[model samples]
Target: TFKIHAYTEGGKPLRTIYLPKLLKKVFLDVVKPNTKKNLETCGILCGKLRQNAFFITHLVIPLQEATSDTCGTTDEASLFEFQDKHNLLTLGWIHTHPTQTCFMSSVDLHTHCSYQLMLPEAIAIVMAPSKNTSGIFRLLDPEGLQTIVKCRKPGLFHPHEGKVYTMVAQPGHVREINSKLQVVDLRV
Candidate 1:
């Protein structure tokens, strides 16, 4: 299975994030409708974590505002309502950069900061279909996260101070594993 590893400012391995093969396809499909529109589309990553490893198994596309460069959702009530129904955790978020490259903007860092605050393993997945590149990244750690949390910039800002954060390699592909499925009887 392929693994995505991130390092800290000191160039030390930090955490590993894994994705299943099916999830890659799922991401593409969910964003297909918005790809050509040059608009941003976003979704939530959900799954259970086990043995120090995070396995992404579900993708939830929430309703949001989309522009050529920005996408966001303010309906937190409904968003969490759905997630609660599914018993999913706020692992992270994935968004598209239809026309730009793969990298988090200052605003993105703030958004991610909230996610990371909720869960240290939270990540931001930036997909640039036009550039044919995508990256899964996160703040370095206490240092990077704290730096971003304290920053007041509204637009893009440099959060990396001497490799304070790491990016997953190009073509961020993950390994596939066989998971068991259960069949339920619907007749009640």
Candidate 2:
């Protein structure tokens, strides 16, 4: 992992998360076929939050049901089982936007809220093939997160305050490294 004594903009201590830059690109390749077909693909970012930092070693692709707009996992049991059997923390997630821009929509916000609730440093990576870029993000703590927690909205298409998240400086929490990049596709 890169030697980085990382801190948030507020000067709080933050653990750096090392990811495989190669496999990070591999994520797009893995989903390229799907992207071209107008279907979105999602993956779970699983790893170990060791004593001081996080290491993303496994990018697990779950069995999912999807459309051009939305995609989600179907087998909760096995996802947990995979995490349990592998002894990895559910650090975050990654997904593709085949047709839309690289930003979190209302549905994406609602989905990521739970991940952030469980892990403050959780990340959400949105891949936009059209723009040839990806955005890694997190909800604003105590404000955006609190608002979502208090929201009683009932559907994925409803309006959110639209000011909830910001990108993680890949320069900050994200470090490039090779971890024998494990890509597990349950969709197989």
Candidate 3:
């Protein structure tokens, strides 16, 4: 179910992303401590591009400092150290909001902008456990992407006029695959 109105996805060809169905649950299990404490847990979706489709082979839970309202990764050097060693691609990212609803706040749009600008197929996977829901999303390139990328103003909590992001259709580019997933928890 895609609540989007993108007729042209940045003029890019359809690129599929294959993820393990159980990945979301396993990820939650690893970060339950944070969730129980009403904090945030985010993971980097590391994978490879093959057959013109993306496959999630690794989920990197970076060492991060999170509060009830915000979460950001630390240990930046190590995170990329592992990714480069494994030669993986940063397809997207995962974040959990223990209290808030499963919607990207304005701050989130800026954070996601960095990833989406890196690649059009990049996405934002948000899970609001308290709300008992999740959303897989992408910026509607022509409007959202162009809008943020060109914005010269810096800092968070700024205004972003118009619709910025829209959920992608499940089972389409974002589909589940039967494969073993490697959990690369850098926190340890």
lDDT of 3 by residue, 1-188 (tens): 23222233556554778888888888888889999999998999989988677889998999899888677887799999999999999999998999888988777887888898787778889988888899998887778988877777656667788888899756665888788799988886
C-alpha lDDT values of all predictions: 0.66, 0.83, 0.83
Per-residue lDDT for 1-188 in model 1, tens only?
32436444546543444555455455666677777888887878777666656666667777677777677875667767766776767778888888898888766777888887777767788888888887787777777778877777544554444444555432332224554211111111
Model 2, residue 68: distance off in Å is 1.3
Candidate 3 has its poorest 10 consecutive residues by lDDT at 1-10
Error of 2 at 131 (Å): 1.6
lDDT of 2 by residue, 47-84 (tens): 99776788898999998987887888997788889989
| lDDT of the structure predicted as candidate 3 | 0.83
In terms of lDDT, the poorest run of 10 residues in model 1 is 179-188
Full ranking by lDDT: 3, 2, 1
Which is better, 2 or 3, measured by TM-score?
A: 3
- Flag regions of model 2 displaced more than 4 Å: 1-13
Question: Each prediction's TM-score against the native?
Answer: 0.76, 0.89, 0.90
Q: Candidate 3: misplaced stretches above 4 Å?
A: 1-8, 152-155
How many backbone clashes are present in model 2? 0
All candidates: CA RMSD in angstroms?
6.0, 2.4, 3.8
